[PDB]
Amino acid sequence: DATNSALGKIQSVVNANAEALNNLLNQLSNRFGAISASLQEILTRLEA
Amino acid sequence: GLYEMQIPTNFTIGHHEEFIQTRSPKVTIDCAAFVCGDNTACRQQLVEY
């Protein structure tokens, strides 16, 4: 309960892993295409 | 007893040399600079990536 170094490292590890996964999730929003990151928006707007 | 003297006598001392790498340069890359330079128009697209 007094800024323990091990707890610091433990939380840092947990956070780092969470960040890695969130970066991957956020990747989906990249919109590499010309219309939308949402497949449904592409599919229901463009010609087949 | 004969053998230790048949082999170059007096217990003569010679030498060898060896080398081990252990390291490499600390290469670092400014991802954004690499992809886009001072070109603001580029950086404004790059942000999505």
> At which residue do the structure tokens 């082999």 appear?
B7
Tell me the technique behind this structure: cryo-EM
Phi, psi of A36 (to 5 degrees): -160, 155
Cα angle: B17, vertex B21, B27; to 5 degrees: 155
Distance CA A25, CA A43 (A): 21
Q: Nearest to residue A37, comparing CAs of A47, A27, A23?
A: A27
- The greatest distance separating any two alpha carbons of chain A, rounded to the nearest whole angstrom, comes to 62
* Shortest alpha-carbon distance between residue B15 and chain A (Å): 49
* Entry resolution (Å): 4.0
Tell me the DSSP string of B18-46: -------------HHHHH--S-HHHHHHH
Q: From B46, which residue of chain A is nearest by alpha-carbon distance?
A: A30
How many contacts, defined by CB atoms under 8 Å, are there between A and B? 3
Cα angle: A24, vertex A28, A33; to 5 degrees: 135
> At which residue do the structure tokens 């890695």 appear?
A20
Q: Are A10 and A3 in contact (CB under 8 A)?
A: no
Distance CA A33, CA B48 (A): 12
CB atoms under 10 Å from CB of A38, counted, come to 14
Tell me how far CA of residue A36 lies from CA of A2, A45, B42, B45, in angstroms.
49, 10, 20, 15
Phi, psi of A13 (to 5 degrees): -65, -45
